[PDB]
Symmetry: C3
Amino acid sequence: SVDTMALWLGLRAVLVVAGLAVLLQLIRGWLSSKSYVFNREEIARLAKEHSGLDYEVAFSKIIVELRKKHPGHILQDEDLQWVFVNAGGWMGSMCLLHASLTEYVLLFGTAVDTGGHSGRYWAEISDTILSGTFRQWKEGTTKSEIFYPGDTIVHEVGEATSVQWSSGTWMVEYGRGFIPSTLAFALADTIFSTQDFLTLFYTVKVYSKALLLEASTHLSQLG
Amino acid sequence: SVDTMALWLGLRAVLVVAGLAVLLQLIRGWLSSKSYVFNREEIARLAKEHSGLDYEVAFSKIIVELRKKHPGHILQDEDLQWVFVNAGGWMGSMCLLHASLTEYVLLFGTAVDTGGHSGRYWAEISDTILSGTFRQWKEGTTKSEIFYPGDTIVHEVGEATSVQWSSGTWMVEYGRGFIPSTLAFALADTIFSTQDFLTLFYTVKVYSKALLLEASTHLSQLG
Amino acid sequence: SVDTMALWLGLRAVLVVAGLAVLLQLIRGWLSSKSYVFNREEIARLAKEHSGLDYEVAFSKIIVELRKKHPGHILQDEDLQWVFVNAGGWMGSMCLLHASLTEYVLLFGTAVDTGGHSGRYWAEISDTILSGTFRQWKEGTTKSEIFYPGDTIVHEVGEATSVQWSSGTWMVEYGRGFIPSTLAFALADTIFSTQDFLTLFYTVKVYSKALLLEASTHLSQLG
């Protein structure tokens, strides 16, 4: 009975600590900046237009269109790089195109069968498929849904689903909200599982280059 | 030769530390309380009896029968909730019905293909399959075994196995032993991989509510 | 406006830390000990020659041939053991035959579908397949390659790939380079995921036994 009481008190302590953590995450999301360069419908339409072609040609055409419609906000050909992404038990790769304090645009996908935790969304993310399949298992339900090239899955803030991607699945991803908070989730398995310090290097490098591009465009627009 | 000696000394240090950890686990397990409300054969027969129905109807009927045969030991309908479980590389979901210092009962399953480490804890676990398949690859062997609805896999005290569950696999799980020791493994991937503080919140909340129900039943029986 | 610069400076700090980590990995792996007992071609042909038999008979004959051609460098039958290996999100099992500061030989494989990160280390790794399939997804590309019994996959120094093995895949693995640099990747999931301290016990025990056997052989050869 004494051990039961001690265990209940410890569980209550962990309960309130986790509640405070989630509350601080929600506060950071609420008080976040809302100056947006893109709209999610725009990225969704642009990615859905080229979903019928090969995914590499689609990547090329979408990058060209993004550079054409938003000059100074997309990285150059010299800065584009495929970087592994290990998070929540799954493994994929990304190619960052745009990333600021409130938005980011990248090409995400995997060439192998993988799946795991989607991560607690404290920012709004949208994925429009170009090839492969995307199986989502939302929280609270016992059934999953399948998504195909042309579909767009939007992840609201606070949602946590079970994601799964077949081999050769590739999509375009646009994130809106408090972008830095996602970094942790993007690097968790890189820190405590894969020990891939070079992947962490490449990730922070491309993010810093995207921030530098955004600041340079800001200065050139006001200067 | 010097580096080899240093590496061997470090390996011996890790060896003795891990041995002391295993010794602490076994000591806190053997000397744990053994006040049992249920027995694994009761839950096994209750789950196998309704294993032919749809897994949702089976869940409902099993919950009703548990509340009929053990009234003050099953959580209320207002306290039932599906909570994600990320551990050992695999991801699923649970709904807890009973949980004490020495026992716990829940409904566990996944709607997607998953698998990984079963985990090591001082607790005899029993899983009776309601739907789906369960592949178990025990330690020390090079071949696995498949289990179908109606079967009951018994994870013994020294269980190091590889588990795998196909999409739509649902089962009823009963565990007796040092239940808090099973918390760590159940939350490790939640801490270092998923960054899901809300799932940790839900887990500790439902465990605290189950312990509260058990303590309330105990006090109402002794008073 | 200002927080962009703040985040960029933080990313620069993380960048220099990760860069120093990678540079130290390179410098320590380079300029290391060059005492080699085996070579990847010998092990590759020894495994490919027996790749047509059942994998257990192949294991036995390969161990016998290794003890015949390199006596004193292979563990005894009393020291052989199958130990689970959780790393990078995948779960397999190993049987260590030889391990020193510069080389290691073991029998690896899995009885369940698994996959994940291969890991980065200054160590040339070669795997010759006896059964099952090995899908490798190298870094920087969007397509993977399948390998079959008889094939030998070379994990180059400093490379990072996505590995995937079907159920029943078994292979003979030979590592050359700075072996301790892999140890971290070999145990991360054991510490932050499986919490399996007995598997860690077994791993460090077999590594210490291999190092002790190597030291004994060296002393007997010079004494």
